[PDB]
Design a protein around this nucleic acid. Structure first.
Ligand SMILES: Nc1ncnc2c1ncn2[C@@H]1O[C@H](COP(=O)(O)OP(=O)(O)OP(=O)(O)O)[C@@H](O)[C@H]1O
Ligand SMILES: Nc1ncnc2c1ncn2[C@@H]1O[C@H](COP(=O)(O)OP(=O)(O)OP(=O)(O)O)[C@@H](O)[C@H]1O
Ligand SMILES: [K+]
Ligand SMILES: [Mg+2]
Ligand SMILES: [Mg+2]
Ligand SMILES: [Mg+2]
Lengths: 591, 405, 386, 199, 351
DNA sequence: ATATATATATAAT
DNA sequence: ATTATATATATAT
C-alpha cells in the first residue's frame, strides 16, 4: 500500500458517494468543555485576524514617499522618447532590503501605482522560469499580450498594433538569481530597437548596489542609465497600530513579546514572520483558554457575559487573578460571588470595563512619556516606542533604578526645549479623542498658558512622575487580565525556531530523560545510544567495542548484527561518511 | 577590360568547368571507365576519392559532361546530387531523391513500410547515377541507413546504380561499419597533388591566360605574350616559391590571382611584378600582431605583466589579482607616477581583453566566481609580444624597457 | 548625410573587390577589427551608396538558427518587390534560389552582410561552413561578409572549410581621431575653437581610451564646462591658457566618475548646470575560507590565491568560539547560513551532498567584512594573520 | 555479517519497555493541536532522535481517515521530487498525460489547486533529509507546493544538519511548527537499504 | 568477346542456384525446418558469423526448396515473411510490418503488438537482430518468446554478426569464415566453363583475402577489378594484374599522402617527431610543437613562420586526419597526437 | 498524447 | 575538458 518498486502511493475515495465534505472547525473541538463556546471562539479569532491583516496592509501602503520619485523618473526619461542616436536605456535600481519575503508585496504594491498613472503595460519576470534566451522572451511576450517562435520583431509588431505612445515597464524581482548570459544578451538587442520599442528596466536589488558591476561588465554597463533609489522603522509603526491601539482587543505578554522581537532583530529582519507570530498566538490563545470568547469588542464582551453555561461560570471563578481579587474583599462579598452566578455576572461586566478603561488610560500616557523621552539626549530607557513598551510591561519603571537617572536628566532642560516638549504632549491628548484623562489635558494647557524658571520647572518635572505612577502599571496586577492576555513563552518560541541538533545531542547522551526508568544517572541503552557514545573509528575495532559493551549489558551472532544495524542507523544520521585512508576514519560531530 | 574581368572572375571565384587537368590522368581514367561501365551495363560500383581544394568537384563534372555528349547516354540517364552539409538527416535526404528524380508527383500520398520500400518504388518507374558530395558527414548519422541502402541496392538489385563518394578523410574506412564495408568495393581514386614546383610555374602561366575564342585578337596576342614575359621574371618566382612552400593547392593560387587582377583598370592595362608582390602581402598577414597594435596604452601594460608572470611561475594559470599586483610594482617603482590608475578602470582593460579573446578561461563557470580571482590563461605567445611592441606607433619609453627586463 | 573620413584605401579595396554587377566576387570576406574602426558604418554606407540590394543582420539578435534564416529571406523579398517559412539549412538554400530569380535580381551581385560574427559558431557546427561556401552551393552570384572582432584562426572549424580573404581595418591614430571629432562642429562657435577643445581632451584621455565611441560621448558632456569662461567674460577665444586651465582638473574627475559610469551622464550634465547572527556567520566563513587550518587552534581556542573551500564542521566551530555566549543550534541559524548563499555572499562548491555536504566559500571582499566587524565591535584583523 | 542474518535474528529484547510505552500516548495528545494548525496555513516538521515514522503512521490511522492523503518515503532509494509531482498530477487530478518540465508540471498543479477550493490534499513526508530530496530545487518545488491554502504537510527530519535545505525565503514558504517528538523505537525500515552498502 | 562474360559472372548480384562449399549447413537448416513444419510445432533458431559467410543466400535457398517441396505437395503449404533490421526506419516498426504482411489491416505499433500477441504455418525471417535492440529489450524478448507457444506454430530464424548476442537478453548454429580451399573452389566455380583466368592469379587473390579477412565480396571485387586492369593492357589475366589490383584495394594511402606534402607541413611533422623524442609522451601542446618548428625553419632556411599561418598548416594536416587535434576554438592549447605511427612517418620523410 | 532522438543545462569525473 | 544525467525541443507514432 505504501511499499512497491515505485514512488507514487495516492489513495482515492472513488466509486463511493462521499462527495460531501467536512467543514472546518470540526477539528478545533479537541476537548469537550462546551460545544458552542468553540464556534464563537473561532469566529472571534477569524474577525480579529482579518482586521489585523487589513490594518497591516493599509499601514504598509502608507509607508507613497518612494513611489512619487519613481513615477516622476518614469515620466521624465520617457519625455526624451516623446521628443524623438545611441540612447542609453534608463534604468531604476530599487534597493530593497535583506527581507526577501517582504519583496512580494513591495513589488506587488508598485504595480497598480504605475498602472494608474503613467503606463498601461507593466509585466514581471523571475529567474526561476527564465534560464535561457528562448524562455526569457517567451514569458515576456505572453504577459505583455493580456495587459510560433516569437522574437524581438514580434514585440515591435505588437507595439505598433496596439498603440497606433506609452512606455513599457519591465521589472526584474530578483536580479541576483538571473544568469549572467541572458542579462548581457537582452540589453544589447533591446537598445538597437529603442526607436520602435521604448523599454525602461527596473531591477530588484537586495544587496548593496555593487552587484551590477559583478554580473554586468563595463562594455554593457555603459548602455544603461543607472539611477539609485532606496525594516526598523516599519516594525515600530506596525507594532503601534496592531497592539498599542485599543481597537484590537487581543494583547500579548512581555515574554511572548520578548520571543517575537528576538527572532526579528537577531536572526532575520522580516515583518511578515512577525505577522506570522501573532497569528499563531491569537490561535493559541483562543484554544488554551475556554473563556477567551470575552476577548472581543467591549459592548459585545458584556453581551457574552449575560448568556453563559454554568461550567463557564465555574471557569470564571478559578482564575488566579479572580482568586486574588475575592481575597482582598470583605467577608460577605466572598460568599456573594462564589455561590450565585447571577451576582458573578454583574461583577464581571464591571471588571471588563475596568479592564478596558485602564487600557485606554495606559498607552495614551505611554505616548506622552515618549515625547519626553525621545527629546532627551543619550536615551537611557530607549529611543524607540517598541523599546519603551518592553521595559514598563515587564515591571514598573520607577521601581527600577534606571528611571531615576532619567528624572535627574529630565530636570536639566532649558526653556526652549520644554516649549517643544509640552507642545507635543498637549497634541497627543487632542489626537486620541474620548480619552479618559480630562483634568490632565487642561493642566498641560495651563502650563503652556503660563508662558523663577527653576521652581516652575520642578513642577513640570513632577508633572510626569505622578502621572505614570497612576497609569503605568504591569497588567499581572489587574483582575480578569487573562481574558485578553496570553503568556506561553516556550510554546511560541519552539514553534517558530527550535534546535534539532540538541534534540539529537541530548537524547543520545542521556537515554534517561525520555525514559524516566533509571536508564542513566551520571552499558544498558538502545542500540544507537551505545555506538554513539563509544566514538564520542576503524570498523573492525569499533565492532569489538560494541561487542564488549552490549554483552556486558545483556553461537548467537546477535551482538554483531546489532552493530551492523546501529551504525547504518548512524550513517543515515549526519555522523558517518566512509573514507579510504583507513577502513573508516571520520568524525563529523566534533562538538 | 570588361570581358577579361568577366572570364577570370568566373574562372577563379565561381569555379567552373575548364578543360585543363594537371596530374590526374589515371585517376580520370579509372573514374571514366567506372561510370562508363555502370552507365552502359548493369554493373554497379562504389568509390571513395583528397584534401581540400584538390579538384574533386572539378573532375567529376568534366566526366559527366564528356559522358553526356554521347547521344544514347543523354536520352536515358538521370542524375541526383546530394551534399553532406545540406541534408543532415535521412528524412531530409529521402525527400531530395523523390524531388530530383521528378517523381514527387508519382509518389504522392502513397505510404511505404520501410526506407528501402520507399527507395524501391522510386527506382521501378534506365540507369541512375548518385553523386554524394562531402561524404564523411553522411557517415555520422545514427545507423548509416542511407549508406547501407544505397550499397545494398547496388550490390544485389538489377537496376544499375553508381555511388561515387567525395571526402577529405584519409581514414575514411574506419568511420563506416563492418557491413557497409563488406558491400563497398574498395576502389580508391587518389587526387593527391603529386606535381612539382616547375609544374607549378607552368600552371601559373596557363590559368592566367585568355582563351582563343576572344574576339579582339591583337590585344589577346600581346596579353598572352605579357604573361609569358612575366612568367620568366625572377621577381614573381620568389613569392610563388613562398606560396608553393606553404601549399600545393591551386585554390590558394586562385586566391592570389584575383587580388593581383584587382589592380588592373583602363589606366593600368597590363599586370606588373609589383602587383603580384602587393598581392602576396595581403594573404600573408599575421592576425594576432595586428590586434596588439590597436590595443590601448593601458591594455599593453597588462599583457607585459602577464608575460612576466609566465616566465617565473611557468605554465601555471593566473587571475586578475595576480595581474593587478604585478602592475602595481611597475607604476610605483620601475617607471614613474603617471599610469598609477585606480582599480575600477583596470577592470575595463581586463574586461576588454577577454572580449577580444586574447585571454581564455582555464575553467568556464559563469556566476560561480567573481569577475576578479578567476583563473585565466594568456593565449598570446612570447614571440608575438616583443615584435608587436617594436611596431607600436608611439610606445612609451620605459614600457618597452620593462618588457625586455 | 553620411561621410567616411580617413577611410579611403580600405574602401577602394571594397569597391574594387565588388566590381560591376554581373561580375562574380569572392564567396566570403571576413572583416575583423576593434571596438570602433568603422566596421558597421563604412560597410553600411558603402552598400547603401552604390544601390546594391543588401541585407544587414545582427547575429546576437537572432539567438536561434531558425530566427536568422527568415530574417535574411524576408528582407530580400522586400528588395525584389508575404511570409516564407524555412526550418533547416537545406530549405534555406532551395528558397534562396527561388527569391533571387526575380527580374531585378537575376544578373546582380546580392550581398548578405553579417555583423557580430563571434556568436554564429555557438549556434551550430554546420552553419559557419554553410555561409562560407554559399556561392558554390546556391550558384546565384553571392558574396557574404563577416563583421567580427576576433581573428580568423579561432573561427576555423576542425574539419576545414573554404578560406575567406582576410581584411583589416586599421586603428585610428592620435591625429586620425582628431580629424573625425573636429568635423561635426557646434555652429555657434568657430572651427578652431572646437579643435583646441579636442586637443586638450585627448591629452588626458588617449592613455585609457582609443575607442571612438567613448571619446565622442566624453567630448559632448564636458563641452559646456569648457565654453563657460568665455560666456562669463573672464576669457576669450584667443586666451587658450585660460581655456585649458579651466578644463584641466575637471577632466581628471571625469575619468574616475563619468568614465566608469559611477555618476551617470544625466547627473553630470545637471551638476555643472546647477554649478545579528547573520553578521557573525559572514565573519565566521571569512575566517574559515582565508585562514590555514593549522593555525586555527592558536587564534581561537587561546588573501591572494583566493578562497579555499572549508567544511561546515570547521565553520560552526569558529562561530561558537567568537560569540561570547551560549548559542543554541536553532533551525534559523542553520537556515541563515544558506540565506547568504542565495544572496551570493557565500557559495557552495562541489554539490556532492547538501546536508552532509560541508563545502562552502566566503565570496566577499575584505572591505565588506571590516565594517560589519566594526558594527558589532569585533576585530577581524586580530584573527587573520600575525 | 550478511544482511540475510537479521531476518532470523528477531530476538532482541527492549530493556526499558514499560517507560517507552508511555510516550506514545503523550504525543498522541499533540495530534489534535497539529490537526488544528494544519488547516490555518501552518506546516509541521518533527525534530528528534528516533524513528518518527511510527508516530507519523499512528497519526494517519487516528486522524486522516476521510481525506485524500499521500504518504512520501524519502528513505526509499529510487525516490525523486519528480515522483512526488507525478503522484499528484496523474492520480489526484485523474489526469493521464506527460509534462514537458518539472516546473511546467508544478505550474499545472498549483494552478489547478488555485482554480478549485474543493480539493484538500495531505502531504505526509516521513523523511525529508534523504539525499535524493536534499536538493534546493527539490525543496523549492516542495515549498511552492506547500504555500497554498488547500494542501497540508507533516514532515520529519533525521539529519544532524537538516535545516541547510531552507533559507529565509523557504522558511517563509513552509510555515514550520517545530515539535519535540523523541520516541526511542529504532529505525527499522529506513536502515534496511543502508545496511547493504557496508559489511 | 571473352572478358565481358567474366564481368557478368563475377558480379556479386549473380548468386548461383547451387552454392558450393555450404552444403552441410544447407542440409542441417533444411532438416531443422522439416522437423518443425510437418508436425505443426513452433521453435526458434539463431545464426551468426562474420558478414561474408553467405547467410542470407543459403537461407533463401532453404526457403526456396521448401517452397518447391510445398508446390509438389510433400509438405503442407506455408506463408512466408522476411524483414531486415537495417531497412526499417524505427525499431518498433517490426510489428506494423509483420501485421501488414500477415493481415490486410494496418495500425499503429502498439496496436500491432497487441494484435500480434493475440494472434500468437508461418515462417518468420529476421535479419539484423542488433538494431532491434531497445533499453526495454522488449522487441528482442517477444521475438524469441512468441513462437514457443502451441497457438503460434511459428518458426523464427535470426541473423547477426556477433555470436555471443542471445545471452545478454537473459540454438546458436554458426557459420565460419572461408579459408583457402572453399574460396578457390568458389572462384573457379563461377568461371567453370570460360578460359579467362590463370590459376596462379586465382590462388594469389584467394590467399591474400583469406589471409586478411576471409570474405567473398572482397574476392569478387578484386577479381573484377583485376579483369579491368588486364583489359587496359591489350587475352589472359596474369599474376601481375592481380598483384597490382590487390595493392590497389588493400594498400593504405597514409604514407603516400605524407610523401606528396608541402615543405612546411613536413617540417611541422618533423617538429612533432622531435618534440615527442624530447618529451617521450603522446601529448604535446601547440606552443611546444611551434617552439621546435621555429628552430627547424631557422635551420632549414625557410622564412620565419607566423603563428596564424602555422595554425592553417596544422588545421590542414588535421583535416586530412594525419593528426588528431582539438577544434581550434582554443588556440595555443591544441594538444596533438600522431594518428599515424612514428615508423611510417620516418619511412615517408626519409626519402 | 506517447515515445524517441537531438539539443542544451547541470552535475560528476 | 569530457562524460553522464536531467531536461528542452523536435519529430515520429
Ligand atoms: N590538377 C588540377 N587541374 C585543374 N584544375 C585544378 C587542379 N587542381 C586544382 N584545380 C582548381 O582548383 C579548384 C579545386 O576546387 P574544386 O571546386 O574543384 O573542389 P575541391 O575544393 O577540391 O573539393 P572540396 O570542395 O570538396 O574540398 C578548382 O577550381 C580547380 O579548377
Ligand atoms: N570614417 C568615419 N567618419 C565618421 N564617423 C565614423 C567613421 N567611422 C566610424 N564612425 C562612427 O563611429 C561609430 C561606431 O562605428 P561602428 O558602428 O562601425 O562600430 P563597430 O566597430 O561596428 O562596433 P563593434 O566593434 O562593437 O561592432 C559610428 O556611429 C560612426 O558614426
Ligand atoms: K499548509
Ligand atoms: Mg567540391
Ligand atoms: Mg558593429
Ligand atoms: Mg545479410
Amino acid at each position: 500500500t505504501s511499499s512497491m518498486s515505485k514512488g507514487c502511493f495516492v489513495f482515492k475515495p472513488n466509486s463511493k458517494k462521499r462527495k460531501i465534505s467536512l467543514p472546518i472547525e470540526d477539528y478545533f473541538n479537541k476537548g469537550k468543555n462546551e460545544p458552542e463556546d468553540s464556534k464563537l471562539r473561532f469566529e472571534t479569532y477569524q474577525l480579529i485576524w482579518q482586521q489585523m491583516k487589513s490594518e497591516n496592509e493599509r499601514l504598509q501602503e502608507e509607508l507613497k514617499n518612494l513611489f512619487d520619485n519613481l513615477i516622476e523618473f518614469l515620466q521624465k526619461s520617457h519625455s526624451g522618447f516623446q521628443k524623438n542616436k545611441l540612447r542609453e536605456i534608463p534604468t531604476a535600481a530599487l534597493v530593497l532590503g535583506v527581507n526577501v519575503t517582504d519583496h512580494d508585496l513591495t513589488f506587488g504594491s508598485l504595480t497598480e501605482a504605475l498602472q494608474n498613472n503613467v503606463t498601461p503595460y507593466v509585466v514581471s519576470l523571475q529567474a526561476k522560469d527564465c534560464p535561457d534566451m528562448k524562455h526569457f522572451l517567451q514569458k515576456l511576450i505572453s504577459q505583455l499580450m493580456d495587459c510560433t517562435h516569437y522574437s524581438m520583431d514580434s514585440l515591435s509588431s505588437w507595439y505598433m498594433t496596439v498603440t497606433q505612445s506609452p512606455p513599457v515597464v519591465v521589472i526584474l524581482k530578483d536580479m541576483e538569481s538571473f544568469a549572467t548570459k541572458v542579462l548581457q544578451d537582452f540589453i544589447i538587442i533591446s537598445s538597437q530597437h529603442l526607436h520602435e520599442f521604448p523599454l525602461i528596466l527596473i531591477f530588484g536589488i537586495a544587496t548593496s548596489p555593487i552587484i551590477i558591476h559583478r554580473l554586468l561588465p563595463h562594455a554593457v554597463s555603459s548602455l544603461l542609465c543607472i539611477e539609485l533609489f532606496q525594516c526598523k522603522e516599519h516594525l515600530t509603526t506596525v507594532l503601534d497600530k496592531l497592539l498599542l491601539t485599543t481597537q484590537f482587543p487581543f494583547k500579548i505578554n512581555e515574554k511572548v513579546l520578548q520571543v517575537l522581537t528576538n527572532i526579528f532583530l537577531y536572526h532575520d529582519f522580516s515583518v511578515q514572520n512577525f505577522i506570522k507570530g501573532l497569528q499563531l498566538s491569537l490561535l493559541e490563545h483562543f484554544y488554551s483558554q475556554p473563556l477567551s470568547v470575552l476577548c472581543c469588542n467591549l459592548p459585545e464582551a458584556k453581551r457574552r457575559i449575560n448568556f453563559l453555561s454554568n461550567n463557564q461560570c465555574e471557569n470564571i471563578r478559578r482564575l488566579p487573578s479572580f482568586r486574588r481579587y475575592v481575597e482582598k474583599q470583605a467577608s460577605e462579598k466572598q460568599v456573594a460571588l462564589l455561590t450565585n452566578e447571577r451576582y458573578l455576572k454583574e461583577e464581571t461586566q464591571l471588571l471588563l470595563e475596568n479592564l478596558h478603561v485602564y487600557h485606554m488610560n495606559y498607552f495614551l500616557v505611554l505616548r506622552c512619556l515618549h515625547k519626553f523621552t525621545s527629546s532627551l539626549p543619550k536615551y537611557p530607557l530607549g529611543r524607540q516606542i517598541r523599546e519603551l513598551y518592553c521595559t514598563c510591561l515587564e515591571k514598573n519603571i520607577w521601581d527600577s533604578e534606571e528611571y531615576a537617572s532619567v528624572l535627574q536628566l529630565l530636570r536639566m532642560l532649558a526653556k526652549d526645549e520644554l516649549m517643544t516638549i509640552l507642545e507635543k504632549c498637549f497634541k497627543v491628548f487632542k489626537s486620541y479623542c474620548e480619552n479618559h484623562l480630562g483634568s490632565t489635558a487642561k493642566r498641560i494647557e495651563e502650563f503652556l498658558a503660563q508662558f523663577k524658571f527653576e521652581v516652575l520647572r520642578e513642577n513640570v518635572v513632577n508633572f510626569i512622575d505622578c502621572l505614570v505612577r497612576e497609569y503605568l502599571l504591569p497588567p499581572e496586577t489587574q483582575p480578569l487580565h487573562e481574558v485578553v492576555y496570553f503568556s506561553a513563552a516556550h510554546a511560541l518560541r519552539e514553534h517558530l525556531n527550535a534546535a534539532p541538533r540538541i534534540a539529537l545531542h541530548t537524547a543520545l547522551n542521556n537515554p534517561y530523560y525520555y525514559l524516566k526508568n533509571e536508564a542513566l544517572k551520571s552499558n544498558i541503552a538502545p542500540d544507537i545510544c551505545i555506538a554513539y557514545k563509544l566514538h564520542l573509528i576503524n570498523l573492525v575495532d569499533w565492532s569489538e567495542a560494541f561487542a564488549t559493551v552490549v554483552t556486558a549489558a545483556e553461537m548467537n551472532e546477535i551482538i554483531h548484527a546489532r552493530f551492523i544495524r546501529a551504525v547504518s542507523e548512524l550513517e543515515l544520521l549526519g555522523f558517518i561518511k566512509p573514507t579510504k585512508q583507513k577502513t573508516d576514519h571520520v568524525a563529523r560531530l566534533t562538538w | 577590360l570588361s570581358q577579361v574581368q568577366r572570364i577570370l572572375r568566373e574562372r577563379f571565384c565561381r569555379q567552373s568547368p575548364h578543360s585543363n587537368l594537371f596530374g590526374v590522368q589515371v585517376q580520370y581514367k579509372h573514374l571514366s571507365e567506372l561510370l562508363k561501365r555502370t552507365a552502359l551495363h548493369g554493373e554497379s560500383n562504389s568509390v571513395l576519392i583528397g584534401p581540400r581544394g584538390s579538384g574533386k568537384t572539378m573532375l567529376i563534372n568534366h566526366a559527366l559532361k564528356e559522358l553526356m555528349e554521347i547521344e544514347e547516354v543523354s536520352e536515358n540517364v538521370l542524375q541526383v546530387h546530394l551534399n553532406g552539409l545540406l541534408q543532415i538527416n535521412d528524412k531530409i535526404a529521402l525527400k531530395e531523391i523523390t524531388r530530383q528524380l521528378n517523381l514527387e508527383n508519382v509518389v504522392g500520398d502513397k505510404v511505404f513500410g520501410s526506407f528501402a520500400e520507399n527507395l524501391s518504388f522510386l527506382l521501378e518507374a534506365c540507369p541512375v547515377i548518385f553523386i554524394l558530395d562531402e561524404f564523411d558527414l553522411f557517415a555520422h548519422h545514427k545507423n548509416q541507413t542511407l549508406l547501407y541502402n544505397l550499397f545494398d541496392i547496388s550490390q544485389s538489385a538489377q537496376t544499375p546504380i553508381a555511388v561515387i563518394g567525395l571526402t577529405c578523410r584519409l581514414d575514411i574506412l574506419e568511420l563506416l561499419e563492418k557491413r557497409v564495408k563488406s558491400r563497398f568495393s574498395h576502389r580508391q581514386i587518389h587526387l593527391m597533388n603529386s606535381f612539382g614546383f616547375p609544374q607549378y610555374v607552368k600552371i601559373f602561366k596557363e590559368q592566367l591566360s585568355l582563351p582563343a575564342e576572344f574576339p579582339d585578337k591583337v590585344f589577346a596576342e600581346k596579353w598572352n605574350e605579357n604573361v609569358q614575359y612575366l612568367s620568366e621574371d625572377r621577381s614573381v618566382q620568389e613569392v610563388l616559391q613562398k606560396h608553393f612552400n606553404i601549399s600545393k593547392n591551386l585554390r590558394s593560387l586562385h586566391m592570389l590571382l584575383m587580388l593581383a587582377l584587382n589592380r588592373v583598370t583602363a589606366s593600368h592595362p597590363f599586370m606588373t611584378a609589383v602587383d603580384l608582390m602587393e598581392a602576396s602581402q595581403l594573404c600573408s598577414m599575421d592576425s594576432k600582431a595586428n590586434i596588439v597594435h590597436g590595443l590601448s596604452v593601458l591594455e599593453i601594460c597588462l599583457i607585459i605583466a602577464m608575460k612576466h608572470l609566465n616566465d617565473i611561475y611557468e605554465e601555471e594559470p593566473f587571475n586578475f589579482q595576480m595581474v593587478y599586483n604585478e602592475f602595481q610594482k611597475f607604476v610605483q617603482r620601475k617607471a614613474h607616477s603617471v599610469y598609477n590608475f585606480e582599480k575600477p578602470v583596470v577592470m575595463k582593460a581586463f574586461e576588454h581583453l577577454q572580449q577580444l579573446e586574447l585571454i581564455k578561461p582555464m575553467e568556464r563557470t559563469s556566476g560561480n566566481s567573481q569577475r576578479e580571482y578567476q583563473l585565466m590563461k594568456l593565449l598570446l605567445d612570447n614571440t608575438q609580444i616583443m615584435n608587436a611592441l617594436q611596431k607600436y606607433p608611439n610606445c612609451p619609453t620605459d614600457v618597452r624597457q620593462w618588457a625586455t627586463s | 548625410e553620411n561621410v567616411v573620413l580617413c577611410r579611403e584605401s580600405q574602401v577602394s579595396i571594397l569597391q574594387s573587390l565588388f566590381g560591376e554587377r554581373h561580375h562574380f566576387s569572392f564567396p566570403s570576406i571576413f572583416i575583423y577589427g576593434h571596438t570602433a574602426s568603422g566596421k558597421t558604418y563604412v560597410t553600411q554606407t558603402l552598400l547603401k551608396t552604390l544601390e546594391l540590394p543588401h541585407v544587414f543582420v545582427n547575429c546576437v539578435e537572432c539567438f536561434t538558427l531558425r530566427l536568422l534564416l527568415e530574417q535574411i529571406l524576408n528582407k530580400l523579398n522586400h528588395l525584389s518587390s508575404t511570409e516564407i517559412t524555412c526550418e533547416t539549412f537545406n530549405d534555406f538554400v532551395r528558397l534562396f534560389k527561388q527569391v533571387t530569380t526575380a527580374e531585378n535580381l537575376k544578373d546582380q551581385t546580392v550581398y548578405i552582410v553579417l555583423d557580430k560574427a563571434e556568436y554564429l559558431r555557438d549556434m551550430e557546427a554546420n552553419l559557419l561552413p554553410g555561409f562560407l561556401r554559399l556561392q558554390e552551393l546556391a550558384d546565384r552570384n553571392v558574396t557574404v561578409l563577416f563583421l567580427s572582432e576576433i581573428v580568423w584562426e579561432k573561427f576555423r572549424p576542425n574539419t576545414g572549410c573554404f578560406e575567406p580573404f582576410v581584411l583589416y581595418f586599421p586603428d585610428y591614430s592620435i591625429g586620425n581621431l582628431q580629424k573625425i571629432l573636429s568635423h561635426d562642429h557646434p555652429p555657434e562657435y568657430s572651427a578652431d575653437f572646437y579643435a583646441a577643445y579636442i586637443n586638450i581632451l585627448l591629452g588626458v584621455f588617449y592613455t585609457v581610451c582609443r575607442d571612438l565611441k567613448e571619446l565622442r560621448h566624453l567630448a559632448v558632456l564636458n563641452f559646456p564646462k569648457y565654453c563657460e569662461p568665455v560666456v562669463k567674460g573672464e576669457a576669450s577665444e584667443r586666451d587658450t591658457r585660460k581655456l585649458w586651465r579651466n578644463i584641466e582638473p575637471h577632466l581628471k574627475k571625469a575619468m574616475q566618475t563619468v568614465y566608469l559610469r559611477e555618476i551617470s551622464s544625466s547627473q553630470w550634465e545637471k551638476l555643472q548646470k546647477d554649478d545579528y547572527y547573520s553578521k557573525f556567520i559572514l565573519i565566521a566563513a571569512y575566517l574559515a575560507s582565508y585562514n590555514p587550518a593549522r593555525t586555527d587552534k592558536r587564534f581561537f581556542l587561546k588573501h591572494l590565491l583566493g578562497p579555499k573551500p572549508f567544511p561546515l564542521d570547521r565553520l560552526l566551530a569558529i562561530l561558537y568560539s567568537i560569540v561570547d555566549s551560549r548559542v543554541a543550534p536553532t533551525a534559523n541559524i542553520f537556515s541563515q547560513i544558506t540565506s547568504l548563499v542565495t544572496l551570493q555572499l557565500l557559495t557552495l562548491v562541489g554539490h556532492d551532498d547538501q546536508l552532509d555536504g560541508p563545502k562552502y566559500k566566503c565570496t566577499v571582499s575584505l572591505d565588506f567584512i571590516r565594517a560589519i566587524a566594526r558594527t558589532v565591535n569585533f576585530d577581524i584583523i586580530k584573527y587573520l594573520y600575525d | 555479517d550478511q544482511q540475510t542474518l537479521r531476518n532470523l535474528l528477531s530476538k532482541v529484547s527492549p530493556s526499558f519497555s514499560a517507560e517507552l510505552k508511555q510516550l506514545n500516548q503523550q504525543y498522541e495528545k499533540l495530534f489534535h493541536k497539529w490537526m488544528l494548525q494544519l488547516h490555518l496555513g501552518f506546516n509541521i516538521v518533527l525534530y528528534g532522535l528516533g524513528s518518527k515514522r511510527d508516530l507519523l503512521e499512528r497519526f494517519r490511522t487516528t486522524m486522516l481517515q476521510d481525506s485524500i492523503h499521500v504518504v512520501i518515503n524519502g528513505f526509499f532509494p529510487g525516490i525523486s521530487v519528480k515522483s512526488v509531482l507525478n503522484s499528484i498530477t496523474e492520480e489526484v487530478l485523474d489526469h493521464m498525460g506527460t509534462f514537458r518540465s518539472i516546473l511546467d508540471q508544478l505550474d499545472w498543479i498549483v494552478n489547478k489547486f488555485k482554480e478549485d477550493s474543493s480539493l484538500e490534499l495531505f502531504l505526509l513526508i516521513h523523511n525529508l533529509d534523504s539525499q535524493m530530496l536534499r536538493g534546493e530545487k527539490s525543496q523549492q518545488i516542495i515549498g511552492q507546493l506547500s504555500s497554498l491554502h488547500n494542501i497540508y504537510l507533516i514532515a520529519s527530519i533525521d539529519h544532524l544538519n537538516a535545516p541547510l535545505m531552507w533559507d529565509h525565503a523557504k522558511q517563509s514558504l513552509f510555515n514550520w511548527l517545530w515539535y519535540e517528538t523523541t520516541t526511542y523505537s529504532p529505525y527499522t525500515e529506513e536502515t534496511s537499504y543502508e545496511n547493504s552498502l557496508l559489511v | 568477346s571473352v572478358l565481358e562474360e567474366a564481368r557478368l559472372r563475377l558480379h556479386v548480384s549473380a548468386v548461383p542456384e547451387s552454392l558450393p562449399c555450404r552444403e552441410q549447413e544447407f542440409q542441417d537448416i533444411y532438416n531443422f525446418v522439416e522437423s518443425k513444419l510437418l508436425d505443426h510445432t513452433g521453435g526458434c533458431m539463431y545464426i551468426s558469423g562474420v558478414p561474408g559467410t553467405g547467410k542470407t543466400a543459403t537461407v533463401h535457398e532453404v526457403i526456396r526448396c521448401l517452397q518447391q517441396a510445398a508446390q509438389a505437395n510433400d509438405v503442407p503449404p506455408f506463408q512466408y515473411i522476411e524483414v531486415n533490421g537495417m531497412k526499417l526506419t524505427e525499431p518498433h516498426q517490426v510489428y506494423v510490418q509483420i501485421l501488414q504482411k500477415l493481415t490486410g489491416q494496418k495500425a499503429t505499433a502498439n496496436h500491432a503488438a497487441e494484435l500480434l500477441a493475440k494472434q500468437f504455418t508461418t515462417v518468420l525471417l529476421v535479419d539484423e537482430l542488433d538494431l532491434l535492440w531497445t533499453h526495454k529489450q522488449d522487441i528482442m524478448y517477444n521475438l524469441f518468446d512468441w513462437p514457443t507457444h502451441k497457438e503460434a506454430r511459428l518458426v523464427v530464424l535470426a541473423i547477426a554478426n556477433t555470436m555471443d548476442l542471445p545471452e545478454r537478453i537473459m540454438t546458436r548454429m554458426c557459420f565460419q569464415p572461408y579459408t583457402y580451399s572453399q574460396l578457390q573452389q568458389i572462384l573457379r566455380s563461377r568461371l567453370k566453363h570460360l578460359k579467362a583466368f590463370e590459376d596462379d592469379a586465382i590462388q594469389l587473390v584467394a590467399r591474400k583475402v583469406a589471409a586478411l579477412s576471409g570474405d567473398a565480396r572482397r574476392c569478387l571485387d578484386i577479381c573484377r577489378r583485376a579483369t579491368e586492369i588486364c583489359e587496359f593492357s591489350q587475352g589472359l589475366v596474369t599474376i601481375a594484374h592481380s598483384m597490382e589490383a590487390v595493392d590497389e584495394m588493400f594498400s593504405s594511402s597514409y604514407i603516400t599522402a605524407i610523401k606528396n606534402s608541402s615543405v612546411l607541413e613536413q617540417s611541422f611533422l618533423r617538429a612533432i617527431l622531435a618534440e615527442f623524442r624530447r618529451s617521450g609522451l603522446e601529448e604535446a601542446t601547440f606552443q611546444q610543437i611551434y617552439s621546435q618548428h621555429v628552430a627547424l625553419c631557422r635551420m632549414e632556411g625557410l622564412p620565419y613562420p607566423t603563428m596564424s599561418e602555422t595554425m592553417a598548416v596544422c588545421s590542414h594536416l588535421g583535416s586530412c586526419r594525419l593528426l588528431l587535434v582539438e577544434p581550434s576554438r582554443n588556440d595555443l592549447l591544441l594538444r596533438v597526437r600522431l594518428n599515424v605511427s612514428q615508423d611510417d612517418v620516418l619511412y615517408a620523410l626519409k626519402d
